[PDB]
Design a protein around this nucleic acid. Structure first.
Ligand SMILES: O=c1ccn([C@H]2C[C@H](O)[C@@H](COP(=O)(O)NP(=O)(O)OP(=O)(O)O)O2)c(=O)[nH]1
Ligand SMILES: [Ca+2]
Ligand SMILES: [Ca+2]
Ligand SMILES: [Ca+2]
Ligand SMILES: [Ca+2]
Ligand SMILES: [Ca+2]
Ligand SMILES: [Ca+2]
Ligand SMILES: [Ca+2]
Length: 903
DNA sequence: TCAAGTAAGCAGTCCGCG
DNA sequence: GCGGACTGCTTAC
């Protein structure tokens, strides 16, 4: 096999690399890597190295990395550019792996671990590590085993060994229900004392040294705690054995309102799953506890136990260990679904960076672009300092708040990356500037043509057309990968809908799910077999189709995130290729394109309808337009359609055969007007929306910018078995909105869009009557809580104190003096409830850590004083009033003359 | 919330608005 | 009581 790196580090003048050799063996080596950097040289001096602008450079080979770093300093002292890759390990990787890396995940040791620490005096601070580690479960991907290290004797209690037989039993048998499929994969090791436990763990670590280290909150808790605990018991040298190169560093992570410490283990790539999840999942959760996320992702019930966690080991050590093992498995289950580790490896090896650098788009793109240029013997420029400056972004049309019955939307393919490609926007393709007219003049095609020679953006920038810039070139490669995976995602999505349809008529029989690749549209043969399958088999296929779709979603959406991140990076001062001229060339072209096509679509449709100045485009945001199709439907006549699907087909055909060609013509003209290098503005139909044929549903409504709801029948070629609500921006979509309220508001919207005003009124009246029965957690608001200290005037709300912060201060007084009560963590999220006047908490609201039950110390009192009236009005009635006034409907039946008596 | 970008919504505080 | 200036938080893209 071809070799590939596992990890790389710079330690002084040595590169330390762990890698898989040509025989598939893990190896380590120390290399005295001599780096090269570059300086501009005279035209005379013959060279093969040129900077991205075509100016000649001399290569400087240094005796060692320290010399190179020092030279960079002196070059700054002199005031001259020091060119080349200043991150020496990236240059090392580029030299050592000068080919497209193909990696084998089966050779990469991926470790997933979790520890337990009993603490009777509150949260056990990793930086202190004053409490024994009493459990470690460590899963190894190469062995496919869970290694369980269990402390039987501690100052906080001596316990009996964990029993695998009881662990396997159902909760109803008194067991812990450790999943049967991992029972045989557990290697259990009890220990007489903590020193023994930790010494054995370190020996185990040495034999099975993680390459990728993951788990839940491992970077902020598990790793620093293990490191600091071993340091406290044995000393520094022993704790550094967690690093294969025996090198560690405390890293201070700074944010706006403080800082925290983590331990960097040289020679290990830490990918904390909570951070992977936050970056790659595209969710915003009310809580990020493993329990909450597992339930959300996997639909597994929370891990139940009696009493506080600080008494769990002593009271039920059996459950204690089982839950430690289950916690490790949950992360594995989430990754089996989401595949973020696979994604991270793909991206890391593609860019040739330390795997953990995938968290940084800037680092990722710096490496991709460096490797690309190096292949042509080109030399990258030095990074410079820039002051942070605001710059303009996308255009969003102000909609007329209203109901909108029939709607067709259209969307540009991967807009920002397409603009970069079309215009040829790159650091080295800048050709000059032209005199800009007001954006309106370009939108209306009355401005003078910018250039007869170069490719232009309406921000005034011109670009070369003779060759592609490196940014367009590299962005295209990733865009093409993204396209492939999106293809698989949509096929799986369409396949899912085929199965749902079949599920309307499941056969009475015993059979098996078909063995198929869900990434490709089902053939006619497969469809026929599906129509004969049992519900059991069909549901299994649906689950599998949906898992395939999730895998495709992960692969496609995060590759899109990467290329969009490059457009954004051009506007970040730490990016080597930072340039507001290029960042704004993109955004400004975007504004023109959206409004240009709005005009063209309006023009086209007015022509087809034979009307004048009518506004068909009702809304647009960045790269999408929403078109009223009422007149198109009315041209045929609603009474002439057989069913809902009939007009959906009709609108689909009209969009594809009439509107898209017109849109294409419009954008080709714009391309020529801007003299762009390549036409890549591809705007296809996205959604077809409307009420069910013959219903009183309103189809859709807008309340304002970034706030709307549509009843969609077809999305990007997926014809739904059942209509799907597309709701953007509304309270149903916000993590701050109480869970039960999201649900209720969503049902109100469904009724508005699908059934009509009377159905809406029926549901509202019922929710209003019954909501007081809802679990307090389901009706609590949620909010991140920052700057708590700023607003704490020992210990009451200071001036301008935010509502949720006030709740926290209320909570803090109510639990003061209590060492064991759960503390609100700065920067985390809290549940928030309003309190009725005269309550014993002495304030109008209380807040506690999200994803948790409020402590029994005050639960009863909170429940008794909860202000249901305020809650309802603020979280439900206000938003609903917004929806209904926009849609021009009433959520409460207004009086009429008919109310004048039945008999 | 360490880690690419801007636009823009709504809750809430403070306080004017005769 | 509503709206502006402002902070805080959260989405859409
Ligand atoms: O996180 C984002 C999302 C979007 N954008 C910009 C770039 C993107 O091209 C544009 C439109 O975003 P979409 O959600 O429409 N996705 P995009 O058009 O990039 O690809 P596609 O529409 O094909 O999914 O908005 C960002 O800069 N950052
Ligand atoms: Ca735990
Ligand atoms: Ca790849
Ligand atoms: Ca798009
Ligand atoms: Ca998309
Ligand atoms: Ca059937
Ligand atoms: Ca869009
Ligand atoms: Ca207001």
């Amino acid at each position: 096999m071809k070799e590939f790196y596992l990890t790389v580090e710079q330690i002084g003048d040595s590169i330390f690399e762990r890698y898989i050799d040509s025989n598939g063996r893990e190896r380590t080596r120390e290399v005295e890597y001599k780096p090269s950097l570059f300086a501009h040289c005279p035209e005379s001096q013959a060279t093969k190295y040129f900077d991205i602008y075509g100016k000649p450079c001399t290569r400087k080979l240094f005796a060692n990395m320290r010399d190179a770093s020092q030279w960079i300093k002196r070059m700054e002292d002199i005031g001259l550019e020091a060119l080349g890759m200043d991150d020496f390990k990236l240059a090392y990787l580029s030299d050592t792996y000068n080919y497209e890396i193909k990696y084998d995940h089966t050779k990469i040791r991926v470790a997933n671990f979790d520890i337990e620490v009993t603490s009777p005096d509150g949260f056990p601070e990793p930086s202190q590590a004053k409490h024994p580690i009493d459990a470690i479960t460590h899963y190894d991907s190469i062995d496919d085993r869970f290694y369980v290290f269990d402390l039987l004797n501690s100052p906080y209690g001596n316990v009996e060994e964990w029993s695998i037989e009881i662990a396997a039993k159902l909760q109803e048998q008194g067991g812990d229900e450790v999943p049967s499929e991992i029972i045989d994969k557990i290697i259990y090791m009890p220990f007489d004392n903590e020193k023994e436990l930790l010494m054995e763990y370190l020996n185990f670590w040495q034999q099975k040294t993680p390459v990728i280290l993951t788990g839940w909150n491992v970077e902020s808790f598990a790793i620093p705690y293990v490191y600091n605990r071993i340091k406290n018991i044995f000393g520094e040298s022993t704790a550094k054995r967690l690093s294969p190169h025996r090198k560690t560093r405390v890293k201070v992570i700074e944010n706006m309102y403080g800082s925290r410490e983590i331990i960097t283990l040289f020679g290990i790539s830490v990918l904390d799953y909570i951070d992977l999840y936050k970056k790659f999942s595209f969710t915003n959760q009310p809580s990020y506890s493993l329990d909450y996320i597992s339930e959300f992702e996997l639909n597994v019930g929370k891990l139940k136990y009696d009493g506080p966690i600080s008494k769990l080991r002593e009271s039920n050590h059996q459950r204690y260990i089982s839950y430690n093992i289950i916690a490790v498995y949950r992360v594995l289950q989430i990754d089996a679904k989401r595949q973020f580790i696979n994604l991270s490896l793909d991206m890391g090896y593609y860019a040739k960076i330390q795997i953990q650098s995938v968290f940084s788009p800037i680092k990722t793109w710096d490496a991709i672009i460096f490797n690309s240029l190096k292949e042509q013997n080109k030399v990258i420029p030095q990074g410079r300092s820039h002051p942070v400056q605001p710059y303009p972004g996308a255009f969003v049309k102000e909609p007329i708040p209203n109901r909108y019955k029939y709607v067709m939307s259209f969307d540009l393919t991967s807009l920002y990356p397409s603009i970069i490609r079309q215009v040829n926007i790159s650091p080295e393709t800048i050709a000059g500037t032209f005199k800009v007219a007001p954006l309106h003049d370009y939108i209306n095609a009355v401005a003078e043509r910018p250039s007869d020679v170069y490719s232009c953006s309406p921000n005034g920038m011109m670009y070369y057309k003779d060759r592609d810039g490196v940014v367009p070139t590299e962005i295209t490669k990733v865009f093409n990968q993204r396209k492939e995976h999106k293809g698989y995602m949509l096929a799986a999505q369409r396949n899912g809908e085929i199965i749902k349809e079949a599920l309307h008529n499941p056969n009475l029989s015993v059979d098996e799910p078909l063995d198929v690749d869900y990434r490709f549209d089902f053939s006619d043969e497969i469809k026929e077999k599906i129509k004969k399958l049992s519900a059991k088999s069909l549901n299994e296929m649906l689950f599998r189709a949906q898992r395939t779709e999730v895998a495709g979603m992960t692969a496609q959406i995060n590759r899109k995130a990467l290329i969009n991140g490059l457009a954004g990076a051009l506007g970040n001062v730490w990016f080597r290729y930072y340039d507001l001229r290029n960042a704004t060339a993109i955004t400004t072209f975007g504004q023109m394109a959206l409004q240009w096509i709005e005009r063209k679509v309006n023009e086209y449709l007015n022509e087809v309808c034979g009307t004048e100045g009518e506004a068909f485009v009702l809304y647009g945001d960045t790269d999408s337009i929403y078109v009223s199709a009422d007149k198109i439907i009315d041209k045929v006549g609603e009474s002439k359609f057989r069913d809902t699907n009939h007009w959906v087909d009709f609108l689909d055909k009209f969009a594809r055969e009439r509107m898209e060609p017109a849109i294409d013509r419009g954008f080709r003209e714009m391309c020529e007007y801007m003299n762009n290098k390549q036409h890549l503005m591809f705007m296809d139909r996205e959604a077809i929306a409307g009420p069910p044929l013959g219903s009183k549903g309103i189809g859709g409504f807008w309340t304002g910018k970034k706030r709307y709801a549509l009843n969609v029948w077809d999305m990007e070629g997926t014809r739904y078995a059942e209509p799907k609500l597309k709701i953007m921006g509304l309270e149903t979509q916000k993590s701050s909105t109480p869970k039960a309220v999201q649900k209720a508001l969503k049902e109100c919207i469904r009724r508005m869009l699908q059934e009509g005003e009377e159905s809406l009124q029926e549901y509202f009246k019922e929710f209003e009557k019954e909501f007081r029965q809802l679990n307090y957690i389901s009706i609590a608001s949620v909010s991140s809580a920052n700057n708590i200290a700023k607003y704490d005037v020992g210990g009451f709300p200071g001036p301008k104190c935010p509502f949720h912060i006030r709740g926290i201060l209320t909570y803090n007084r109510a639990i003061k003096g209590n060492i064991d009560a759960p503390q609100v963590v700065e920067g985390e999220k809290v549940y928030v409830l309003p309190l009725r006047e005269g309550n014993p908490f002495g304030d109008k609201c209380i807040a506690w850590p999200s994803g948790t039950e409020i402590t029994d110390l005050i639960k009863d009192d909170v429940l008794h004083w909860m202000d249901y009236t305020v809650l309802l009005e603020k979280t439900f009635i206000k938003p609903l009033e917004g929806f209904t006034s926009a849609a021009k409907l009433d959520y409460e039946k207004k009086a009429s003359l008919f109310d004048m008596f039945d008999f």
